Amino acid sequence: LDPISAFTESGDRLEVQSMLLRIVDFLKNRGITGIFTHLLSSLMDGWVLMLNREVNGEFNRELYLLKARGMAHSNQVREFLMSDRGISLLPPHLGEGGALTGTARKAEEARLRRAEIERQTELGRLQQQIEQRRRRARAQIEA
Amino acid sequence: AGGGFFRGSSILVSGVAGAGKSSLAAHFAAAACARGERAMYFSFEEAADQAVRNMRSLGLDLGRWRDAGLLRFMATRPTFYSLEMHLAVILREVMRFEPSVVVLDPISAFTESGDRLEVQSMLLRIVDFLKNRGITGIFTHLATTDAGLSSLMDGWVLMLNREVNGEFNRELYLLKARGMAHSNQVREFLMSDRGISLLPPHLGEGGALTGTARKAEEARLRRAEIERQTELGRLQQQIEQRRRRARAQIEA
Amino acid sequence: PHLGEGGALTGTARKAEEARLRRAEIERQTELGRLQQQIEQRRRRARAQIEA
Amino acid sequence: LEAELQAEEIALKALVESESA
Ligand SMILES: Nc1ncnc2c1ncn2[C@@H]1O[C@H](COP(=O)(O)OP(=O)(O)O)[C@@H](O)[C@H]1O
Ligand SMILES: [Mg+2]
């Protein structure tokens, strides 16, 4: 049913909700899966929230699952990318920052990589200084 | 304080969708049936067999009590009657069944069906009948602004599914319990095969957190303690070596 | 009633801030005393150098 | 001299740790 918002936007609330309840009841009675796309949510046994949010001047695509009565659904907000090959869902990067799940995810990857490179270069500079001071001490002792 | 809500009480399990309000109400009812008592569920948006199947995920076996007759599952829709007819049918079934615990899930369903004054009238009549007959009532509600229905109820349990850093952590508050002392703390209600488990909060800087935030704060404290101990050892070693230096200078 | 800066806090946060303030005053005491003892030992140093 | 060298090494390690902090 793509979309059910068409009925609601115009019809009386009671009337439209009655029709919706009736449709759901009939489908379930006949044992038929029912997808309802919406632009109120407790009449459904599963609820998938789709989002196209704005992040730093760039819009990003996040899908997550906030309802599923008789199962265990992941509470994490995964990043869904649409493409010719199909619709793909990529997991979030866990740890610092939470999930990000966008070009900011790429930015956090880059920042952490830069900081690791910096840590290595600085530990190297300290090792070099320590070796040079050791040589200085050896020389002074020989003197 | 005392071991739970008073028997003659009106409880309000309020929440957003996916907060396990129906699950907590089902736990109430199953406890009633387990104590040798007799209880009703009044589902206004779900089927009885569907409910049994779904709660068997959290570990309850409501089917045993249903078969024993200690559980009656009445499934009726908000729009298939007039709110007055709903009141009448509910009262009649409750009378013939003579329960100890009654669940109404969701009482939010009887909103658009009628005028809001009549909705308050219906809800107040139901609450008064249950209390006056000495029946524990559980009333589930769906939604943060103002509801107005909390005053009629004597106990308030707020369930919450909160998005924190891209994760929906589950939290439970006991907002009100008239005539008792209760925790003003946010316990963390974890839904699992064994059941619903409320875990205590993390007391310290930053609050309770209750989730991946708790894990983050715990890891921060751990790393910081290790850092402090490493600094302590570093300074002790520096002191010892400077002491060797000064003792050797004195010997020179 | 709360007074001064910091706000009413009103809760475990108020109790935590009072604990922080007690700890801060204890640390002030330790700092002052350690500075005094350090001054005394610095003097010992200088007086002994003078003797030498 | 050798002990002073060791202490300086330790101080450099401590500075790296503080930077980590
Ligand atoms: N085995 C399980 N593990 C984790 N979560 C579960 C399990 N079984 C059910 N749930 C949770 O129970 C929720 C349904 O609770 P429900 O009582 O329907 O709340 P509401 O009445 O607000 O819709 C689902 O969101 C689902 O995540
Ligand atoms: Mg439900």
Author numbering:
A (entry chain G): 361 to 399, 412 to 515
B (entry chain H): 258 to 400, 407 to 515
C (entry chain L): 464 to 515
D (entry chain B): 516 to 536
Sentences from the paper on this structure:
Here we investigate the primordial circadian clock in Rhodobacter sphaeroides, which contains only KaiBC, to elucidate its inner workings despite missing KaiA. Using a combination of X-ray crystallography and cryogenic electron microscopy, we find a new dodecameric fold for KaiC, in which two hexamers are held together by a coiled-coil bundle of 12 helices. This interaction is formed by the carboxy-terminal extension of KaiC and serves as an ancient regulatory moiety that is later superseded by KaiA. Our kinetic data identify the difference in the ATP-to-ADP ratio between day and night as the environmental cue that drives the clock.
A closer inspection of the CII domains in KaiCRS and KaiCSE/TE (Thermosynechococcus elongatus BP-1 referred to as KaiCTE) showed an obvious difference in A loop orientations: an extended conformation in KaiCRS compared with a buried orientation in KaiCSE/TE. Furthermore, the sequence similarity between KaiCRS and KaiCSE is less than 30% for the A loop and residues considered important for stabilization of this loop in its buried orientation (that is, the 422 loop and residues 438–444). Together, our structural and kinetic data support the idea that an exposed A loop is key for the KaiA-independent enhancement of nucleotide exchange and hence autophosphorylation in KaiCRS and perhaps other KaiBC-based systems. The dodecameric KaiCRS showed constitutive kinase activity owing to its extended C-terminal tail that forms a coiled-coil bundle with the opposing hexamer. This structure elicits a conformation akin to the exposed A loop conformation in KaiACSE, and autophosphorylation occurs within half an hour. Notably, the coiled-coil bundle provides additional hexameric stability. In detail, the KaiCRS dodecamer is stable for extended periods of time in the presence of only ADP, whereas for KaiCSE, oligomers are not observed under these conditions. Furthermore, the C-terminal residues of KaiCRS-S413E/S414E interacted with the CII domain of the opposite hexamer, whereas the lack of electron density for the last 30 residues in the wild-type structure indicates more flexibility in the dephosphorylated state. The wild-type protein dephosphorylated comparatively quickly (observed rate constant = 11.5 ± 0.8 h−1) in the presence of only ADP. Consistent with this accelerated dephosphorylation rate mediated by the coiled-coil domain, our crystallographic data showed a phosphate group on Ser414 for KaiCRS-Δcoil but not for the wild-type protein.
